[PDB]
Amino acid sequence: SMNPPPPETSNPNKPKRQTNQLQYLLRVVLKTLWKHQFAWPFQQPVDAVKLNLPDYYKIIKTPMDMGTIKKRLENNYYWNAQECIQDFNTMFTNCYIYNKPGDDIVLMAEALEKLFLQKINELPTE
Numbered sequence: 049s050m051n052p053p054p055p056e057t058s059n060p061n062k063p064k065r066q067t068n069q070l071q072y073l074l075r076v077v078l079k080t081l082w083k084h085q086f087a088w089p090f091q092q093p094v095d096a097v098k099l100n101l102p103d104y105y106k107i108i109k110t111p112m113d114m115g116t117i118k119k120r121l122e123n124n125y126y127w128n129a130q131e132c133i134q135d136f137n138t139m140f141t142n143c144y145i146y147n148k149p150g151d152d153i154v155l156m157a158e159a160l161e162k163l164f165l166q167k168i169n170e171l172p173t174e
């Protein structure tokens with residue numbers, strides 16, 4: 049019970065869309081960040097039981113991780129790039145909320161966020 053259900057990766061009453069920008073967010077942005085040496089903490093939902101973080105979901109009420117984002121992109125779950133970028137930003141912000149400046153996990157998120165921003169600065173045109 050320490051872990052809530054992970055965020056949904058499909059929703060039949062939500063419309064889907066496929067765009068050049070969403071394709072780029074999967075092929076270039078997510079799949080490149082995924083290979084970074086600091087990506088591993090963010091490739092799956094925070095497991096509060098395995099990680100000995102029993103208060104994580106007492107603090108973080110909109111969890112997000114790159115595994116969820118990846119599955120959402122593979123499902124064409126998002127309407128537009130902004131919706132996907134919002135999930136990335138939630139993932140980073142959650143890490144800064146739960147942890148403190150200078151923590152190793154925060155140094156990891158800070159470096160990934162910089163790479164993320166570099167890659168979404170220019171997106172393809174439709």
Ligand SMILES: Cn1nnc2ccc(Cc3cccc(CO)c3)cc21
Pocket residue numbers: 089090094099101142143146147151152153154
């Ligand atoms: C994804 N996430 N969000 N908050 C976390 C806290 C601890 C962890 C585990 C962890 C991983 C790398 C470095 C440390 C030490 O700083 C701890 C993962 C978290």
